[PDB]
Amino acid sequence: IRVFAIPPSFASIFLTKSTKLTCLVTDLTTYDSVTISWTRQNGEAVKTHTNISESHPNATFSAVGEASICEDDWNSGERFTCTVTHTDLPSPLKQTISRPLHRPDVYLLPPAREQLNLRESATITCLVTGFSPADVFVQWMQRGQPLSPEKYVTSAPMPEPQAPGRYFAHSILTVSEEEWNTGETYTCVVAHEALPNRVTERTVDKSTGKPTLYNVSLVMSDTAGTCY
Amino acid sequence: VYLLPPAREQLNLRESATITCLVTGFSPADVFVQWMQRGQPLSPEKYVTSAPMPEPQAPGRYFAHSILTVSEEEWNTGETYTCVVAHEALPNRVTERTVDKSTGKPTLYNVSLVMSDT
Amino acid sequence: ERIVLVDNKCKCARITSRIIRSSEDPNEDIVERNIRIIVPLNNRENISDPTSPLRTRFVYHLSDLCKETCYTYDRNKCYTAVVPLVYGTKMVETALTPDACYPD
Amino acid sequence: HCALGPEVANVAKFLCRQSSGENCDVVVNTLGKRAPAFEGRILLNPQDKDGSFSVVITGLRKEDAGRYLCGAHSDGQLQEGSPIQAWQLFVNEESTIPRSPTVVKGVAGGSVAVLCPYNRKESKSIKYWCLWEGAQNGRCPLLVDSEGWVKAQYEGRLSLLEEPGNGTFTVILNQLTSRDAGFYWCLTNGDTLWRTTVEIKIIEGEPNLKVPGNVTAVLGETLKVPCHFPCKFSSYEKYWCKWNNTGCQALPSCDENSRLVSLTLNLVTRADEGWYWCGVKQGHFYGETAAVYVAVEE
Numbered sequence: 001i002r003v004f005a006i007p008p009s010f011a012s013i014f015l016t017k018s019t020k021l022t023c024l025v026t027d028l029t030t031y032d033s034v035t036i037s038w039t040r041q042n043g044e045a046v047k048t049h050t051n052i053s054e055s056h057p058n059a060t061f062s063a064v065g066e067a068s069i070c071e072d073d074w075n076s077g078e079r080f081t082c083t084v085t086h087t088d089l090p091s092p093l094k095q096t097i098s099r100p101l102h103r104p105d106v107y108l109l110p111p112a113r114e115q116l117n118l119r120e121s122a123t124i125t126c127l128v129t130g131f132s133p134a135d136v137f138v139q140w141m142q143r144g145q146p147l148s149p150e151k152y153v154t155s156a157p158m159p160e161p162q163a164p165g166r167y168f169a170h171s172i173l174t175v176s177e178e179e180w181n182t183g184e185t186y187t188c189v190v191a192h193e194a195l196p197n198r199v200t201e202r203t204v205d206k207s208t209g210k211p212t213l214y215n216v217s218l219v220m221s222d223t224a225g226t227c228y
Numbered sequence: 229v230y231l232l233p234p235a236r237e238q239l240n241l242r243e244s245a246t247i248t249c250l251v252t253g254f255s256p257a258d259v260f261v262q263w264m265q266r267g268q269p270l271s272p273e274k275y276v277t278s279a280p281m282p283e284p285q286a287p288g289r290y291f292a293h294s295i296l297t298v299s300e301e302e303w304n305t306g307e308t309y310t311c312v313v314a315h316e317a318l319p320n321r322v323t324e325r326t327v328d329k330s331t332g333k334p335t336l337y338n339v340s341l342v343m344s345d346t
Numbered sequence: 347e348r349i350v351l352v353d354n355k356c357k358c359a360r361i362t363s364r365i366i367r368s369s370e371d372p373n374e375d376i377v378e379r380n381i382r383i384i385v386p387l388n389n390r391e392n393i394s395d396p397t398s399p400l401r402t403r404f405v406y407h408l409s410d411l412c413k414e415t416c417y418t419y420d421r422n423k424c425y426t427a428v429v430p431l432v433y434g435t436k437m438v439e440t441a442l443t444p445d446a447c448y449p450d
Numbered sequence: 451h452c453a454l455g456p457e458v459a460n461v462a463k464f465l466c467r468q469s470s471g472e473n474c475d476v477v478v479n480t481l482g483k484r485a486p487a488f489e490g491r492i493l494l495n496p497q498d499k500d501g502s503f504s505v506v507i508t509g510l511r512k513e514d515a516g517r518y519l520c521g522a523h524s525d526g527q528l529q530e531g532s533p534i535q536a537w538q539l540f541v542n543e544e545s546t547i548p549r550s551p552t553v554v555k556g557v558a559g560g561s562v563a564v565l566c567p568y569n570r571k572e573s574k575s576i577k578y579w580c581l582w583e584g585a586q587n588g589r590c591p592l593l594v595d596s597e598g599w600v601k602a603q604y605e606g607r608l609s610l611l612e613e614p615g616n617g618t619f620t621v622i623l624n625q626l627t628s629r630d631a632g633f634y635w636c637l638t639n640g641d642t643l644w645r646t647t648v649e650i651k652i653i654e655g656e657p658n659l660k661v662p663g664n665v666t667a668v669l670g671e672t673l674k675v676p677c678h679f680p681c682k683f684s685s686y687e688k689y690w691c692k693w694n695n696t697g698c699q700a701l702p703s704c705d706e707n708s709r710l711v712s713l714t715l716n717l718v719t720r721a722d723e724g725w726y727w728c729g730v731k732q733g734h735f736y737g738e739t740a741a742v743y744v745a746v747e748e
């Protein structure tokens with residue numbers, strides 16, 4: 001008996017603005033005639049939950065709702081109560097899931113200088129700091145082109161050490177250090193809900209970072225007040 | 229409109245200071261000018277103005293002057309001065325310039341510039 | 347070839363940058379941040395009120411302008427301070443810089 | 451404007467650009483050759499009685515400034531001793547041309563909306579729209595204008611319109627397909643002549659709007675056809691319109707919560723035959739639309 005209900009995630013929400021909720025039923029009795037029915041807080045029916053699933057490898061028929069709703073219809077605590085009646089359940093088992101802040105801070109550290117002497121691994125670090133809540137999604141963008149999802153590796157939002165309850169996660173990515181001569185700043189696209197446009201992109205390249213050759217060049221004249 | 233400040237020599241006769249508002253290279257004739265300072269106008273009996281008369285070099289463009297007399301301590305007080313000109317080739321019809329002790333021919337340049345977080 | 351990190355035309359600052367792609371050795375290059383300022387030592391502190399003292403300090407928190415009291419007349423956008431004229435009094439406009447306040 | 455004589459009319463033509471070591475790199479040829487960086491944004495008119503012709507280049511970039519040569523040769527390239535004509539080019543970079551989006555992404559069956567700028571002073575000209583053609587000496591025929599002429603193949607799914615009207619107008623194109631991909635040019639009848647170019651890419655998915663397919667109908671009744679919209683179009687105003695050379699006009703009082711703006715036709719004649727569009731507004735900008743054709747039976 002394992003029947004968990006999946007609340008929507010800002011990953012898919014950012015993907016297609018398609019907040020979705022599923023309450024899959026698993027390891028129950030092995031019978032057909034399985035019905036899926038979700039309800040809002042008025043109790044009314046739902047949309048095209050479809051695409052039947054076969055018996056599990058452990059020989060139990062698998063079924064799950066496919067419930068699309070409105071992003072606005074999620075923000076006031078709607079206990080999405082889904083019922084499933086079955087042959088074994090004259091008392092069908094119900095499932096529910098509903099809607100249960102701090103700004104993130106994103107940086108992008110360049111590789112290490114000693115990293116850039118082995119002459120293969122160009123590590124790059126993007127990051128996020130001190131934010132609430134979790135569920136945030138991140139990804140890296142390279143010239144308007146999302147990278148290989150396996151190319152980077154994403155953390156999970158473990159909580160802050162000293163902050164009251166804020167969150168932070170990480171992600172790391174490698175490339176050829178020979179590539180760390182074209183650079184192209186490898187833009188890491190954060191995606192958090194609590195942003196004015198829900199994206200706080202930042203990026204960093206070789207030319208960015210820190211130089212060790214200044215040349216300040218103040219000039220001085222009456223022939224000014226102009227800023228050509 | 230340039231605006232020349234009083235000659236240091238005149239500052240040593242120790243009473244009166246003179247400032248020369250100037251206009252140049254303009255057409256047609258009949259510029260108008262007055263002098264303005266501290267947001268109060270200066271009644272014309274302080275200042276005297278020229279009339280047009282052709283440039284030696286410019287075949288067409290006239291010029292003019294204006295002169296103002298003020299106690300040196302008054303000019304030593306700081307107490308800048310602004311001469312305004314109105315003339316029908318000027319965009320909003322009116323430009324002007326100013327000068328005090330510090331702007332005009334200072335012996336002293338005191339920059340103290342700070343540049344943080346290179 | 348340089349990359350203008352900042353070009354603040356009302357402070358006359360211009361932070362560029364340029365990687366000095368070295369002699370064709372391995373990646374022992376150093377990036378390079380040129381800077382440039384043209385401080386006027388002629389203007390007011392209230393850039394748009396020529397009845398104030400001149401200026402002494404010129405403070406450049408580059409952090410602030412790596413992104414409003416800035417002190418050069420920008421060439422292109424022009425200024426003015428309404429100024430009394432007397433012919434009687436009249437409280438009337440001016441054009442504190444020419445050749446940019448031309449309604450054209 | 452290249453101005454060679456009639457004495458090389460049989461001979462091909464070319465256009466190169468000066469480089470460092472006395473070496474033109476060719477940009478387009480009478481032999482159909484064309485530089486890959488300049489793909490799309492180059493035109494070439496046919497040659498005149500004197501062989502005079504012109505070359506139109508749109509969307510110039512910072513490295514495009516320099517010296518240009520147009521000539522006539524059997525190989526259509528540089529050689530010693532062949533007639534030439536020179537130009538020196540400069541790109542401003544202190545420009546007033548508004549930065550408009552250059553690439554516009556759409557899906558098969560979806561819509562596209564394109565903002566096209568022009569100089570604000572000649573707003574009373576006749577806008578045009580042309581499609582670039584390669585695999586040729588390069589061609590670009592018209593597709594639509596502002597009086598309302600439209601190419602004969604696209605009846606129903608295409609309209610342009612002067613909603614913004616401050617030197618910017620909007621174009622709406624729905625029912626997108628992956629075969630339509632390419633480069634599009636915008637034209638004007640003004641003396642100054644911007645030719646802003648936009649590329650349409652086609653990606654995977656289904657359009658956000660949902661409307662039933664092509665449907666037949668009986669004469670003289672009441673019929674309703676729906677149009678639901680997703681939650682991202684929920685912050686707008688919604689409308690239906692009837693497509694023609696005049697374009698859209700909405701029909702006020704057909705609504706729900708954030709879905710299902712539905713058209714209703716009280717009585718119908720065959721004069722109401724044609725395509726209808728369902729779309730949303732961005733305050734004073736346009737968004738996604740979708741189309742459906744309706745027949746009349748008896």
Ligand SMILES: *[C@@H]1O[C@H](CO)[C@@H](O[C@@H]2O[C@H](CO)[C@@H](O)[C@H](O)[C@H]2NC(C)=O)[C@H](O)[C@H]1NC(C)=O
Pocket residue numbers: 392393394395426427
């Ligand atoms: C000091 O500078 C400030 C802003 O830099 C000026 O404030 C306003 O300036 C505009 C300019 O057109 C005037 O129309 C306003 O009347 C000004 N407001 C006030 C409260 O003065 C200010 O004018 C400057 N100082 C002086 C004495 O003009």
